[PDB]
Amino acid sequence: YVPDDRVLVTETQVIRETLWLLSGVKKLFIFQLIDGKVTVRNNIIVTHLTHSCLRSVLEQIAAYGQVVFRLQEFIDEVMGHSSTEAPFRTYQAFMWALYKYFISFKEELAEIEKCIINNDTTITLAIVVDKLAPRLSQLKVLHKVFSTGVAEVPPDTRNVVRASHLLNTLYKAILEYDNVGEASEQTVSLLFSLWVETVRPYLQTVDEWIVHGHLWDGAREFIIQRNKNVPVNHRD
Amino acid sequence: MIHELLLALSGYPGSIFTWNKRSGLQVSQDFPFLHPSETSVLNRLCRLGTDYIRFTEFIEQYTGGLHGIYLRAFCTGLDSVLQPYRQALLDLEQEFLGDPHLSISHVNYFLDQFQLLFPSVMVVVEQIKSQKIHGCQILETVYKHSCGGLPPVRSALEKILAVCHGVMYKQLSAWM
Amino acid sequence: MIHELLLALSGYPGSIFTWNKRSGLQVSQDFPFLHPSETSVLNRLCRLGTDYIRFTEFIEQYTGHVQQQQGQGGLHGIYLRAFCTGLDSVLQPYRQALLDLEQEFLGDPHLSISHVNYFLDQFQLLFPSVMVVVEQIKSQKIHGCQILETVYKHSCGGLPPVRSALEKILAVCHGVMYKQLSAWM
Amino acid sequence: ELVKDVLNVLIGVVSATFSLCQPAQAFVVKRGVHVSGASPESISSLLSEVAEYGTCYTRLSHFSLQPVLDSLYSKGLVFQAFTSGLRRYLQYYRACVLSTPPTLSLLTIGFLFKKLGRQLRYLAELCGVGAVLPGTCGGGPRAAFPTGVKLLSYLYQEALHNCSNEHYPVLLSLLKTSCEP
């Protein structure tokens, strides 16, 4: 046997790191990035566990990081923290609805960090992944919903179809959980809230049309494409 | 080696606790740091642990052929009734941290409540997986195995019975 | 780290949070205390605070500072004055939400910037949405009542926080044009 | 802590004084440059803001303090009523400062006086007084403040230019004093 060269780490440091990665942050010392895939960090070790067992519990959390590093990698873009007269009013009701859920879990990951600096009581990986189990269970729902609904879209498309596919995908996603018993009444009342915000610009556009007659489909947002009115209300 | 016994009676594969998809968990080495009698206890612990591993693989495979709504309902049932396993393996940390002297033989006084339950209930998804079963016919094999002797198994598959009957009661609540 | 950051997000930079006029608030990228986990959380907060430094500058530079003396319209006027008071009234929420941390960074003896980043992540949403408004003004040389169109345009952005902030700017500037119309008619 | 006497020093004693002296050195403030019991540059950048509000209160009050008594030979009687209303304003400012609990943080002070500190920097630079010697200027931009018709018209022009602004009722109060003669 040739000696490995390895770095000892206190497991609460690993726990600080995941609470950062999962609060949607960047470039932890553990959970290093290689190519937009989050990775373990290689020769990083403790005592009560070996090297490759730790590696395998990091892999599972890094693949959960990806979901929310990628949702954060999309909450950064379409809201602009990183064209003129191209405001997609649908991807600024979606990608706002991706956010006021996030608080009530970026937060749980504070009140967790809190007992982890500000008290005595015993906490460890087996006491905390089971603590988070009723919430990482949501993020893998949320990744199939956004993977299918938006990360599958091809590079060039018009401001009708890119909204239409998302407006359709949330509806079939809630029907998949509405019928399957009371097995997690979280996930139906997770998924219904995302759709109701995402329909705001369509349900607004229809209100102007229905009550004030004129419709303002600017940046060509809307299915019925009133490019006809450009030559008409006189060709009668 | 008492925390790796505890993470590999939980899921995750390691290095003491070797895994193979056929054999299950399978400590097999000739360790100079244990009384030689030890590894056959671990292969017995690995048994229930693998009836969590392979018994968990089925769960993440779901939630068409086999991918039916009543199989999801039974399988998210096999989450509700499986959570007592997960919890009963957080609580197995709190002794061994404290008492320096407890040997792994303690763990078998503890978990052998489940040794009546896991390999029996393992035949119901192995049956559903080795045959194929669909629709409300899932809500039969559940009941035909519920008619057992063993009072542990006879109330594992009576909780999964009522959570998947939750689906039948609703589909037959639209319909009426 | 502690209490120095709250002086940095309020507009009083120094030592660790080095202000630079190009990048804004910037942290010094190599320390013995701070591990890799956490300077990149300060940069998120520093971009919000940079937009607040960059907001206080654009407020103070267009009321009280000058009284007509060339007082060019495209760089002043009865409107751009009153925008920066609307903007002052829109920044009261940020000031309040930055005093409410002062009674913890030395009123609750430990915090980590993960709680700060969360607590101010509410304002991580509002500021770039009005930062684009004042960057539209500074590049388009907007003037007079032709700012009420810019305000009312981005008041049609569907985001309810933003649609309240630029509503409260809009009430001030309608105030002004109402005054002019009470004057004339 | 080492500071926060700035509250009463918006009127005057040391941590925001004018001290009508040499601008380079003897123009003095409680400025512990370097070391000084451990507070960094950042606090100096807060304290040297209330130096601006402060030296404009000390100098604008210094400007408004001396009476004219119909005796200064350069000051027609309108200026007397003007300076009287200006002292009414400075008395209201003291009445506000001194009501303030000292049990507030430095940031609360640095934000709470943004209204008055902005609107008083106006009245100072409206007059000749605001650009004398706050620390940036070195006794340069002093010029002729108007008196009589030239005062009371220019006052009306300021009331137009600010007919809507936060500064407006102050200008109306000063103009309604200064109309008396």
Curated annotation (Swiss-Prot), chain A:
Recorded family membership: Belongs to the TUBGCP family.
Entry function: Component of the gamma-tubulin ring complex (gTuRC) which mediates microtubule nucleation. The gTuRC regulates the minus-end nucleation of alpha-beta tubulin heterodimers that grow into microtubule protafilaments, a critical step in centrosome duplication and spindle formation.
Residues spanning the membrane: none
Gene for this chain: TUBGCP5
Compartment list: Cytoplasm, Cytoskeleton, Microtubule organizing center, Centrosome
Self-association state and partner proteins as the record states: Component of the gamma-tubulin ring complex (gTuRC) consisting of TUBGCP2, TUBGCP3, TUBGCP4, TUBGCP5 and TUBGCP6 and gamma-tubulin TUBG1 or TUBG2. TUBGCP2, TUBGCP3, TUBGCP4, TUBGCP5 and TUBGCP6 assemble in a 5:5:2:1:1 stoichiometry; each is associated with a gamma-tubulin, thereby arranging 14 gamma-tubulins in a helical manner. Gamma-tubulin at the first position is blocked by TUBGCP3 at the last position, allowing 13 protafilaments to grow into a microtubule.
Organism listed in the record: Homo sapiens (Human)
Protein name: Gamma-tubulin complex component 5
Expression sites (tissue/organ): Widely expressed, with highest levels in heart and skeletal muscle and moderate levels in brain.
UniProtKB/Swiss-Prot annotation, chain C:
Tissue: Ubiquitously expressed.
Location relative to the cell: Cytoplasm, Cytoskeleton, Microtubule organizing center, Centrosome
Highest taxon in the source lineage: Eukaryota
Subunit architecture: Component of the gamma-tubulin ring complex (gTuRC) consisting of TUBGCP2, TUBGCP3, TUBGCP4, TUBGCP5 and TUBGCP6 and gamma-tubulin TUBG1 or TUBG2. TUBGCP2, TUBGCP3, TUBGCP4, TUBGCP5 and TUBGCP6 assemble in a 5:5:2:1:1 stoichiometry; each is associated with a gamma-tubulin, thereby arranging 14 gamma-tubulins in a helical manner. Gamma-tubulin at the first position is blocked by TUBGCP3 at the last position, allowing 13 protafilaments to grow into a microtubule.
Annotated function: Component of the gamma-tubulin ring complex (gTuRC) which mediates microtubule nucleation. The gTuRC regulates the minus-end nucleation of alpha-beta tubulin heterodimers that grow into microtubule protafilaments, a critical step in centrosome duplication and spindle formation.
Similarity comment: Belongs to the TUBGCP family.
Disorder this protein is connected to according to its UniProt record: Microcephaly and chorioretinopathy, autosomal recessive, 3: A disorder characterized by congenital microcephaly and chorioretinal dysplasia associated with poor vision and nystagmus. Variable ocular anomalies include microphthalmia, retinal folding, retinal detachment, optic nerve hypoplasia, absence of retinal vessels, round areas of chorioretinal atrophy, and attenuated electroretinogram. Most patients have mild developmental delay and mild learning difficulties.
Protein name, per record: Gamma-tubulin complex component 4
Biological source species: Homo sapiens (Human)
Gene that encodes it: TUBGCP4
Entire-sequence positions represented here: 1 to 191 of 667
Swiss-Prot record, chain D:
Highest taxon above the source species: Eukaryota
Compartment(s) where it occurs, according to its Swiss-Prot or TrEMBL record: Cytoplasm, Cytoskeleton, Microtubule organizing center, Centrosome
Subunit structure: Component of the gamma-tubulin ring complex (gTuRC) consisting of TUBGCP2, TUBGCP3, TUBGCP4, TUBGCP5 and TUBGCP6 and gamma-tubulin TUBG1 or TUBG2. TUBGCP2, TUBGCP3, TUBGCP4, TUBGCP5 and TUBGCP6 assemble in a 5:5:2:1:1 stoichiometry; each is associated with a gamma-tubulin, thereby arranging 14 gamma-tubulins in a helical manner. Gamma-tubulin at the first position is blocked by TUBGCP3 at the last position, allowing 13 protafilaments to grow into a microtubule.
Annotated function: Component of the gamma-tubulin ring complex (gTuRC) which mediates microtubule nucleation. The gTuRC regulates the minus-end nucleation of alpha-beta tubulin heterodimers that grow into microtubule protafilaments, a critical step in centrosome duplication and spindle formation.
Associated clinical condition: Microcephaly and chorioretinopathy, autosomal recessive, 1: A syndrome characterized by microcephaly, cognitive impairment, underdeveloped retina and choroid, and epilepsy in some patients. The more anterior parts of the retina, near the periphery and pars plana, have a grayish hue and diminutive vasculature similar to retinopathy of prematurity. Visual impairment becomes evident during the first year of life.
Family: Belongs to the TUBGCP family.
Descriptive protein name: Gamma-tubulin complex component 6
